[PDB]
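Shape is hard to put into words, and the shape of a protein is harder than most. The fold becomes a row of whole numbers, each drawn from a learned catalogue of backbone shapes. The outcome of that step, for a single protein, is printed below.
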Amino acid sequence: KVFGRCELAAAMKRHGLDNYRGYSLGNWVCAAKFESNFNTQATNRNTDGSTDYGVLQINSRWWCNDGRTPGSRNLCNIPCSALLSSDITATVNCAKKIVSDGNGMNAWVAWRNRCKGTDVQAWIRGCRL
């Protein structure tokens, strides 16, 4: 599913991501824009053989099982395909584990490079939340 900016903002908000670990909603939406362009079906393979899945581009090396990443840890206890669903619930639950892990949103390279230190509030501007 390709979400609209505000539609995603509203689902992430409903899912308890606003200010989750001190990260305002705009951060979350910014990261999604840059990681997958708001498409839940986005996949991208990495050099190490791992693959990133979904709107937040969660990696199969640590977070989810895809059956083809040797030495995967499956910390979120889910099949990576679950992360491509139109229902963002599994993405959200798993992102909450990731962000709690120590480096915060820096786990998201596009966030670090494209969102971090920018006026992220722009991402939820005009939205009815």
In short: The radius of gyration is 14 Å.
